[PDB]
Amino acid sequence: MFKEIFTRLIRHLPSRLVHRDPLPGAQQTVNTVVPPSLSAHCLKMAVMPEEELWKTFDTHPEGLNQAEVESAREQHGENKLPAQQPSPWWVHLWVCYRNPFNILLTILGAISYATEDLFAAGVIALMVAISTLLNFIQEARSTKAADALKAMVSNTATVLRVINDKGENGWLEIPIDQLVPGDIIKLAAGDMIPADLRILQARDLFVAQASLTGESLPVEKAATTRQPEHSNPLECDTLCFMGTTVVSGTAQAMVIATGANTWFGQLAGRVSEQESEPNAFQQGISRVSMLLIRFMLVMAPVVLLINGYTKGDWWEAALFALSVAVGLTPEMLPMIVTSTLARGAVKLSKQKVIVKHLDAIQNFGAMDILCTDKTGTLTQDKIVLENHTDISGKTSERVLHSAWLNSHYQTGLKNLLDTAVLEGTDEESARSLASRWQKIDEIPFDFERRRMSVVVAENTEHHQLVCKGALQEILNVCSQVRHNGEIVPLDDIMLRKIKRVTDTLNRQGLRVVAVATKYLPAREGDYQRADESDLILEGYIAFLDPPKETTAPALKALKASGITVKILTGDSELVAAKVCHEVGLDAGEVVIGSDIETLSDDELANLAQRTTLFARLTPMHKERIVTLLKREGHVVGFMGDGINDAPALRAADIGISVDGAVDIAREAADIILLEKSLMVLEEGVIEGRRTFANMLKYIKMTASSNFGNVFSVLVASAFLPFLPMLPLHLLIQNLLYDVSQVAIPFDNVDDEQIQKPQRWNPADLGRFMIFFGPISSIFDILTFCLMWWVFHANTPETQTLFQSGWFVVGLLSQTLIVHMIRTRRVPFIQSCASWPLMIMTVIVMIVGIALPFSPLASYLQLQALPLSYFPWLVAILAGYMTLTQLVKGFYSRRYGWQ
Amino acid sequence: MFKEIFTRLIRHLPSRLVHRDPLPGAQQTVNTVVPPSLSAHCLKMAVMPEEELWKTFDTHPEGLNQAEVESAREQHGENKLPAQQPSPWWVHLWVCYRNPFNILLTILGAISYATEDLFAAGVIALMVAISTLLNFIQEARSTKAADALKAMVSNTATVLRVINDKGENGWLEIPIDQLVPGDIIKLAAGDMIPADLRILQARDLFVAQASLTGESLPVEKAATTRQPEHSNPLECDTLCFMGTTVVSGTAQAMVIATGANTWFGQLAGRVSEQESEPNAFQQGISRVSMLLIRFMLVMAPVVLLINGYTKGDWWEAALFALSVAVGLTPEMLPMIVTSTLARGAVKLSKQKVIVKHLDAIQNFGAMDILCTDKTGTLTQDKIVLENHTDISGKTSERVLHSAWLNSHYQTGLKNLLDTAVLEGTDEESARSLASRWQKIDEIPFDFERRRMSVVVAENTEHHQLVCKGALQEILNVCSQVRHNGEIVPLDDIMLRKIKRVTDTLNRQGLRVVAVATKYLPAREGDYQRADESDLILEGYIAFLDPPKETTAPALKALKASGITVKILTGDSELVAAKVCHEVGLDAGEVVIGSDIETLSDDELANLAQRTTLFARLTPMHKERIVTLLKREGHVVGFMGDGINDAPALRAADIGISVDGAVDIAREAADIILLEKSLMVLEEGVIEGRRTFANMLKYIKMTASSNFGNVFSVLVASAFLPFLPMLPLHLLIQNLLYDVSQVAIPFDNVDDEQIQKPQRWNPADLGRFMIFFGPISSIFDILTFCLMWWVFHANTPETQTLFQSGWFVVGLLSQTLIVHMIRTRRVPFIQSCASWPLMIMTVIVMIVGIALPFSPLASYLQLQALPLSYFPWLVAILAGYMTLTQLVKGFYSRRYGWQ
Ligand SMILES: [Mg+2]
Ligand SMILES: [Mg+2]
Ligand SMILES: [Mg+2]
Ligand SMILES: [Mg+2]
Ligand SMILES: [Mg+2]
Ligand SMILES: [Mg+2]
Fold first, then answer.
1. Left if phi > 0, otherwise alpha if psi is -120 to 50, otherwise beta: which for B153?
2. Architecture label for domain A283-348+684-894
3. Considering A602, A811, B655, B679, which has the largest number of Cβ atoms within 10 A of its Cβ?
């Protein structure tokens, strides 16, 4: 076996259509051990004075104009990884043409027909070129469509730039790949860092660097450094880094590095620069290509040997063997996949489902466990009923005003509670509070405490810290409560009463958020998390988030498909259970996060296969649950649109996000839904299953037909005193058959093939070929006998009649057999193909019939066929179709279709 | 003018595709003054002993088997009105062929070519027959599709019948039209009475006879009569009548009359049997047909006179004039409409919108005011949050148990509150109450008091009356309240406190339903409405009905289309205002029902044009508001699925209902949505606008082209010494052009034509014809000059070259001009037709080109065309297209497209 040189033979698809993106959150080890050049440059750039920063990157405060931005892009490259730049079209055409098979075909043609027999090798090379341009056009169009689809949903950044010739400055939303060094951008809540940044100004900027430094708590970034110099570049309080997000606050910064020059650009791109292990799709494609190479390299040399030993001329024998082996070439796969999946992707783009990389289309059809969250998917993002009450249950205006202050003076991500509180407060009181209070500091949201705080002041004497969050976390840091207008210590009886009331509200489906306030003396230092102590619990706000009207039918459709929906949510188990009961999902027994830390990996993996609803989950818990759900042969899809959903989305077999979400939840995702709905996801899953079924059918049919032709040639060449068909005719047959098959990506797929999650077995293609090759072979032998005896083509002098006699049988049957071997159901009555496929089949059949009668037949060494041959050909085709229809049942019983 | 004989000429479409159904609720006057035969038969059948009832109608207790049911159907006809039976296909073909135009054409052909010139009139009659069969096939297919669509959503009844050969009896759901006299059916809540019925058994059967007797309160129907004999047939307490609904209770009855033999069957069908005034659609179709008849009868006689005076033979002149006038025949309209609207209807059937009668498709596109209800459309039918509390606000199990008793022991229509109460009660307590309490009597729901009551008993000593309803109505009949476990008199302070609490709950969007209980001594008499007094108010249940997620986008799309959505609801104004604010609708100022009784018709009509939300409306108020909303040139659509929505649905210009609803809300409706959603309605409105635009475009283009041909013939006949074209060639041109236009119903419509509600002006067709006729005449004259001078067709001996020379110009231009005159936008770049239309255009153009060169041309008196004529024809076509494109702008400016 061996066949290491097959690595030369197999051409791999570009690494952007298949396989995921780097996702700069991984490999916490020291790649290149923080290389001294990069570390020194970052350290020097951190404390760089602001004045010479303008000269260093040739940047002006007003921004950059056109000529400058293209000059900078030319000098420093583009804001992309080296694996993200598509090759030029002429390079793609050359690499398509430079394959060993076409070059060897041309060389063999020149050698065989160099004996003054020109216009033969010329036509062979012309056919080779026509096939090459066909493949190149297919691949180029599909790759362009896929790249456009991937660029439709891309992370954007807000830049100063220059508008119009007048030089006016605005705020353009441009894709991150268009960024150049020395570009001024602005950062808000939820926007990821697109490249290395030098902070020009910052208002309470807290960013999440857990991806790089491994610390979950957000860190503060200021305009000027506030710490003595430290070696660690990632700890600089004035430089941002690509791959991190902005938790809260606002900023305006300048790009100091881009593309591969960025910190992550070296990391795992150039610092490691190792060979990435191929994913599931690439492995299957490699298996298919290797199987085709094995079959070709096994059978073609036998044909070569037989023809050389018997016929005579060895060169023509080798040319003929290569021509028949071209049918089973492995370089059709780079087109086929690209020609099929991209089409589905385009169709998915019309179903509000953008596919960033074609590989996902496989997994998106193979998904059988879909982890999600109650918010957005199950229930809406807008809450209908909300009542602001104190601990006694009566409506309290103090609680509503404190919540309004906290929501209005926050700078983090917008929340449904914040919007509801802002809308539910009257304009007069809202403006009175706005003109009466002023913001000072903000303590953002983090999962260690799950509380958000804002410190404001009504004067310069005292400050008020107003915090809000989940009930238990607020109660943990509350010592006093404002009951009946008096501040009374919060004893155990009131705690238990509050707990039972909130438990009843949760059981009714109401989410409860508690609010506390505290008064402190005025101080200059920033407020830390330690300041949330001895608070005064003003009250709690209970709000109802109604389930979506379409959630239950979508869940039913998903269960019908076979996708077991599981809920991984950080909310209370009571609210999650009520929501699941409302939407019809079977909660069963709930598992909280605190009950999985003690459990081992095996125990959690054994419990995750039976539990439907998981509550009170930290992002680490979500990542662990998703990771342990794939081991038992399950393809897992995770749907989320949160800040910390990047590890969960990346760890899942497929990640699905929404167009409106934080950047890190879109960069890490593989599928982007234009709207957050389960019905759209289910329809997209069905259509992706159809697309993958179409691709598999294409590969199966092409391989089976070409292997059957090769087997017929191998078995029947010895007895004949000449070539059964001229290799030029075989190339014509292959080209016309490929042109006919062009329409297969548009075929229809039976609902039986797409009723269950798809499992792809590359070894099934070999069984299909072995089963469906001799079928065609038998009728090839019958046609050979018919031409040898009935039509008296017994001598080479009349061989032209013989070969053409097979040609029309070779092309049409190969074209017709598709309609018999595309469905397990009986064709034309129980299952039908698509109109383009039938049109192409009929047109190609007509062209093949008319080729011997066309004036070109003389140039193609084709002789006209007598009218008596037509009934025999029709009978042969009918017998072939009937036999394959009656034989498909045995293949269905022994091995099965899907 | 006069032209009364045009009534003979115009063929009217069948009265089932256009115009509504009888809807047996109308004309409260005494039609036939209660004819003595029917009244006596009903009176005798009412008190008929049950024993001889079986023999009277040949019915057995087990039901009827097949042979008996077909025998009864043959004897007594079918359960349909005389206007609902479609004619046989051969009758339709004959009536299509029996039109004056085709008969006159055949007679003139025989007269003109009876001078031994056979095979001429024969071919003319063959072409006449081909056109007749084309029209008949189109009409028959479209009518069959429309009838199938109307039968898809039809009121059904549950019948005993016989299942299988074993004789087993089941309960078949069969359409009401299949009912035969002497058939046993069962009646439940919400099922309308399908035909005259004799009640065999009844359990608390209360039916609504407000349609016939005019009394809003439901009346009781018993198995045996309980009143002394009374003359009025409609007051019989044992006979049901078609057109009425079952408010509550169960029954099993026998059909005693069917079809026209039913009480309503005489009423307005045979008792009156008057000429129904045509609706909007029929009037417009009559106007179009009359305009075409006027144009034809004006211009054709002039051509006849000119040709007879100049050419010679009068018979051939009359034949030629009739042949050119055939282009403007008015009997194409019965096909066109039926061929277009039905197609849209079929498409509407794929958008979950079933159209019962094609006429609706006009109004459904012309709708600009859509009256609806908050339940179902705006909000969902399932309530998420519900809390059962007493007057003090604490949760009370007594209130929940009383509501459970009332909901479980009711027999009326199921309600969202009833389902929520049934689901929210634990199984143990529910079964304990079920085994502990037993139903005795029920006082159903009616709008005079808006309260429902059920009288049950735990023993034989005392009975408990449990009633529920709106808060104010319950409080009106409550004197005591169970507060803190003690029965205390309900004073004014508690009333005001309850009112303010419930007002706050309504302002939060919670609907509040109060429940009262009372204890009475055991008695044998039935409980009446007077028993609801001195009740004990147990408490109230507040439940939240969340708005649908898709309501706001659907309302935005409807407003973008131009359909002003108005809400006519009987709920409280606070809840309706909160729902409207939630869904984004502008409530503005609300109008309650009590504030429209004093207002006059003019005042209410001037107020309903500015008010968006109407609250606390009785069904009479809804009917009045809908009636007064159409006078100011507005097409009003009413959407409802209630028992009393039949007057509102019928009084509106169009009525839309849901598949799942009471029967009387489906019989009275014109459109049936498979699901209750506003988005489906908006998409259906858009598609119906497209369909009506397609129909109008078809009529306009056909009339304009044929009028242009007639004008060319009229102007250019005098100078020529022979017929410009043989009438056989004109018939060929008309047939081929119609075959080309067949694909117009499948055309594409610009979004500009369907962006606003459509207004149809029949007089616009005349202006369009006048504008676009001479444009097609100028080039006809140019072609005449080209054939006369350039090609030297100066003598009748070479007239065959001349006529054919026009023929190819006549057919292709008429076919091509469509792509220029179908859109106001520039063709082929800014607006494009549909693939079937382009395919048909190209195919018909090819056929017309090849006809002179075909061997049939000799039989059709067509001569082959020289190759030099092709460039001239191409130039003529290009000039015609360019001139019409440049001229369309003037028509757009002066009159406008839509
Ligand atoms: Mg942003
Ligand atoms: Mg600070
Ligand atoms: Mg073959
Ligand atoms: Mg029913
Ligand atoms: Mg009773
Ligand atoms: Mg014309």
1. beta
2. Up-down Bundle (1.20)
3. B655
CB pair distance less than 8 Å for A549 and B544: no
Cα–Cα distance for residue pair B805/A698, rounded to 1 Å: 52
Touching check for B770 and chain A: CB below 8 Å? no
* Residue of B542, B253, B494, B249 whose CA lies nearest to B391: B494
Please name which of B560, B570, B896, B897 lies closest in space to residue B755, comparing C-alpha atoms.
Answer: B560
DSSP code per residue over A386-444 = EEEE-TTSSB-HHHHHHHHHHHHS--S---HHHHHHHHHS-HHHHHHHHHH-EEEEEE-
Looking up tokens 């040319």, which residue turns up?
A319
Measured CA to CA in angstroms, residue B694 lies from B266, B336, B519, B891 at distances of: 40, 10, 67, 19
Neighbours of ion ligand 2 (CB under 5 A): A 441, 526
CA nearest neighbour of B724 among B806, B649, B637: B806
**In terms of CATH, what superfamily is A386-544?**
Calcium-transporting ATPase, cytoplasmic domain N (3.40.1110.10)
Write down the H helix ranges in B355-491.
Answer: 359-366, 397-408, 416-424, 427-436, 471-476
User: Is residue A717 a contact partner of residue A303, using CB atoms and an 8 Å limit?
Assistant: yes
CA B366 – CA B344 distance, rounded (Å): 15
How far is C-alpha A612 from the chain's CA centre?
25
Under an 8 A CB cutoff, do B508 and A546 touch?
no
* CATH 2.70.150.10 residue window(s) in chain B: 20-75+179-266
Residues constituting chain A? 898
Q: What is the Cα Rg of chain B in Å?
A: 34
Q: Are B461 and B522 in contact (CB under 8 A)?
A: yes
- CATH T-level fold of B20-75+179-266: 2.70.150
* Interrupted after residues, chain B (C–N over 2.5 Å): none
Three-state secondary-structure class, residue A681:
helix
Residues of A in contact with B546 (CB under 8 A): 384, 544, 546
Antiparallel, parallel or unpaired: β B184-187 and B156-159? antiparallel
CATH of B353-380+548-674, one of 3.30.565.10, 3.40.50.1000, 3.40.390.30, 1.10.10.10: 3.40.50.1000
Tell me which of 2.70.150.10, 3.40.50.720, 3.40.640.10, 1.20.58.100 is the CATH number of domain A20-74+179-266.
2.70.150.10
Smallest CA–CA distance, residue B384 to chain A, in Å, is: 7
Specify the 3-state DSSP secondary structure of B409.
Answer: coil
Q: Are A182 and A200 in contact (CB under 8 A)?
A: no
B205 close to B222: Cβ distance less than 8 angstroms: yes
According to DSSP, residue A234 is labeled G
CA atoms of B290 and B296, how far apart (whole Å): 10
Active site residue ranges of B: 373
Return d(Cα A848, Cα A831) in angstroms, integer.
Answer: 26
**CA distances to A386, A538, B520, B523 from A383, in Å:** 7, 22, 45, 51
Instruction: Give which of B228, B235, B266, B410 is closest to B244, Cα–Cα.
Output: B235
Provide the resolution (angstroms): 3.8
Give the helix, strand, coil percentages of chain A, each rounded to 5. Answer: 50, 15, 35
Alpha-carbon distance A564 to A371, whole Å? 9
A688: distance to nearest CA of chain B, Å?
23
Chain B contacts of A575, Cβ < 8 Å? none
Instruction: Quote the DSSP letter at residue B31.
Output: G
d(CA A589, CA A607) in angstroms, rounded, equals 10
Experimental method: cryo-EM
Task: Provide the shortest C-alpha distance from residue B145 to chain A (in Å).
Answer: 23
Q: Fill in the amino acid letter for A622.
A: K
Contact list in B for residue A582 (CB cut-off 8 A) is 384
A544 touches chain B (CB under 8 A): yes
Q: Which two tokens stand for residue B469?
A: 């309803």
Radius of gyration of chain A (CA): 34
Residues of A labelled catalytic: 373
